Symmetry: C4
Subunit: 326 residues, 4 copies
């Protein structure tokens, strides 16, 4: 029974695996990085910036969209200000833009002002996507605005991925506890190692023909290709893009060294009652986004040249990994 299967499951993280080099015809410089998330949304690079207050505002989204990616404007501000941020991205060349929403009372009026501004996709940003309140809210958003692409999360199982897709989600966001600034593992004793989480969820998504977002735990370009090869359609970066000038955080100095503050959306500072699930820290100033993305995509291109993956579909469906010890 359920008592007997308590400890049956085994899971993997990024550090547990490596990609096996395979037959290659295509050079890194020529591989296809493009990915179709929904019928209306398609990106040139499989990178989305995080719906965080130390990561994405109009500046991040504009720079992300220019490099061939996407940006999710965070919900930790006024309803009026979030609507104003969406307009700025659209007026900057008719670029793709995303915004975050909750499950509370303010959601219904927040969702209308974001769509009005010209948003392409709405993100139901929750700590626990497999909740009754989330399921109902997913149904409501798609019944009110069926023309706007809906992203729902966060989840870490096939069952949770099934339910959200059945409720009305176009894209499911995968990630329970892998984030650099996350303490959910330590505070709630909950989590599913990201490589397995992506794999179990992508196994379900393949049965619906829908997209999954590999969200959190990415430290380097090598973790981008690992996340994508495990089944992820696109990656969500928080820590790697919070040091760039384009992030809302103000540039500071400490002992002649430049730093930008990066905090979790569940840390004391961001929440300004729930017990904190995130921490507040400091990350080194990286400079222009363009340089960070060029370094990260160069690593992904290199790995796709190693695996012989001409596009992301060939990486997601054919690339093989090997398991190793510490």
């Amino acid at each position: 029974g359920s008592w007997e299967s308590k400890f049956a499951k085994e899971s993997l993280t990024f550090d547990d695996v490596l990609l096996i080099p395979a037959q290659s015809d295509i050079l890194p410089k020529d591989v296809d990085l493009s990915v179709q998330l929904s019928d209306k949304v398609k990106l040139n690079i499989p990178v989305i910036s995080a719906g965080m207050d130390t990561v994405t505002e109009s500046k991040m989204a504009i720079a992300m969209a220019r490099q061939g990616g996407l940006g999710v404007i965070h919900k930790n501000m006024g309803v009026e200000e979030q609507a104003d941020e969406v307009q700025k991205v659209k007026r900057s060349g008719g670029l793709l833009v995303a915004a975050a929403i909750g499950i509370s009372k303010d959601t219904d009026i927040r969702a209308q002002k974001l769509v009005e501004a010209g948003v392409d996709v709405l993100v139901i940003d929750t700590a626990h996507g497999h909740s009754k309140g989330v399921i109902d809210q997913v149904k409501h958003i798609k019944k009110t605005y069926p023309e706007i692409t809906l992203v729902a999360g966060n989840v870490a199982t096939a069952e949770a991925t099934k339910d959200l897709f059945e409720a009305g989600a176009d894209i499911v966001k995968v990630g329970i506890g892998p984030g650099s600034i996350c303490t959910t593992r330590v505070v709630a004793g909950v989590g599913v190692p990201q490589i397995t989480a992506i794999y179990d969820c992508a196994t379900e998504a393949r049965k619906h023909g829908k997209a999954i977002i590999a969200d959190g735990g990415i430290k380097f370009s090598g973790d981008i290709i690992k996340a994508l090869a495990a089944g992820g359609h696109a990656v969500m970066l928080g820590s790697l893009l919070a040091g760039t000038e384009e992030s809302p955080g103000a540039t500071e100095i400490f002992q002649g060294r430049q730093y930008k503050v990066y905090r979790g959306m569940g840390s004391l500072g961001a929440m300004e009652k729930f017990v904190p699930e995130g921490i507040e820290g400091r990350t080194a100033y990286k400079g222009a986004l363009q340089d960070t993305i060029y370094q990260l995509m160069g690593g992904v291109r290199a790995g796709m040249g190693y695996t012989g993956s001409h596009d992301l579909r060939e990486l997601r469906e054919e690339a093989q990994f090997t398991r190793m010890g510490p």
Copy 2:
């Protein structure tokens, strides 16, 4: 035979596992933390403070009982003083209180003075609960005072859990070597990793319908829910509650930093011949108990919201874990 099975067993600790997020209807703020340990004892929070000289005296027990928990008054004092501590807790609003006893000569007269004072539960606090001296003493206490709830330990196997319940114990205390201040693993080469110890013992307890106490190795709130989900009815905390003002230890200062001394009951200082099995250290001053318990229970509530565990019975019987590497 026994030679062939020498190395067959595999065991898990807290760091080896994480709880899998499941379908949730209930919010963390509304989950039930209450647990029925025996017919006479029932707590509002599944937390019991340790029967230690740097952890529990009347002050700890009173603060623990007020927050919805329990406190075990240590036996490392005079027979008269231990009886006086029990009276103080009862006179503080008719609160639930526990006390520790050994297997020596002084036990018989110590047990009578504690019951007289108004104690609810007697704890046979031993290093090795699967001893002949403990088995006999469990039978004697229940034959002399059958009206008082008996807790016996410590054990780490189903066989040891079976024997104590058969001898006369109401609740079995699980923990051989997991304690932060414990050196039994290093000194005696003995121990059973706590997650497996709780699981093997709770597998036995389910066949008797009796309660198990997950004792030791808890570092954070995440380890509380892990211990409970593995089969534990309630958790015993030593290290996490020794820094609070309510603990008997005197507040000291070192390099402008406040500290409270926390030592094992088998360290040189506490024993004041047996070879030491515990160490003497220093832990940072945490402040009021109320704040520590609010932080710890908030983490448990959060995890129960993740696993969709409306109460502790649904956590103990249905919650699933995943295994992961370091």
Copy 3:
């Protein structure tokens, strides 16, 4: 299918294994270190110096060849200078010498000038040997100069080892990501732990009767015998021979301590567009090559005395390993 086998493979590195001591008749001082790589090439010690700009030039190759080994002159210089280096080794007593080549336009004219000078073996030094450009180039070199021994790489699978041997390679170079100065694992998320890589490739080579070069990740003499016992015919050392005086790097001083610069062939400095796959560092000055090789071969001789391996063929075919945790 391919989705189901994504995470089936398990691989081992040097630290995961140790050699089992077996029946011994021969003393370390008397064991045979000689190995036949091709019909024309045979070494007295199974050590080859790396085709790197901080490891091998004529000085290294001469010292290596005198000790009974080989040296691969790097391609990170002018076509004229590389041809001049080969002549110096041949004029130093008619010693065995090797040189590196790519897959670009300059290769065709570079290969002719190296053979003219009197080179014994040509090395197609690539990051990814299982590429179309490498396969074609392997065929071309053997069709133009069939009299010169051809080494091709780098690879990490049996399939890649099969293809190169079928294309025209005499010796296959094994190593994708194990190098001390390598960041391919971190940047590209690609690699195969060296012990398994050598084993899977040597399993294939045994079906062709051809030689494999265990390239990279060797930190000590113990890793030399492990690499050879896993199937390797000879070892390629970069880090262990870059500190010696014979290496092209200029001797420097920092805080009264002597150091020699050692960098990857895929680091920013060596490449002077591709994203860097290697790093630039500093290694302690080791002194004369002779002393380093005497220490390393003494360790291999000792291990061959432990395993009872009278020669390298008895080590490669009969030596057994044990797996262990960290």
Copy 4:
């Protein structure tokens, strides 16, 4: 075949395992520590001091024999001096004493002078006991002096344990690479994790009814009981007894802290050609042997009280271990 079984074996070290607490009738203070090694040799404690130049001379052997143990006088001195050391131990109350011998020319004359002095047991101290030179020497010693107990080693497999017992050894010494001061794993790439080495060898010894010596890798009292429970009849300590005043090393001071030098018998200093397999270091002054042995045996007694092992035979044959991660 042999190629296919290359990586089949899995081995365990001390840190991988812990002893499972079992039914106990006996108290630690009353457990039997005595062990019969041969017909003529029997000790009160299962501890033997190492045949090392920084561990045992007459002073160590006398103190060891008084506490109920044994001491092995090292062979790294003059033939005359080693004979003089044996006499001193015998004149100190007719105590049990052991001495070390090699496989070289000086052995034949060294063995005669040691027996003359009144030695009880001769130890063929080798790095690799599964050598032809050792096998022949084992036969010769038992054919010349059959009245003296013969100890032979070092080995790490059942096959090597079989051969030495068949050649004429009474006791087989188990340990290839576990020693604190050992670098054989790093230098020769050879070794068998000590827990498995003891187990595979003791499995063989049980088929001959002969004794095995668990030699090396013991850091604490917990590793003593683990070594014995895995199959070892007695333990050999080097590092744990080199800090005591009784060890031949001279007491020194560094930054107001007392230290005693402890080096491997295969380090540069002791060897004063073979490549070094051991290192030279410094260990904190421990004081009187009596205090060190009382702390170590108190830990073993405690563990025997946990496992319910009334004697060493019940520990060796019935005690069960559990495996755990790092």
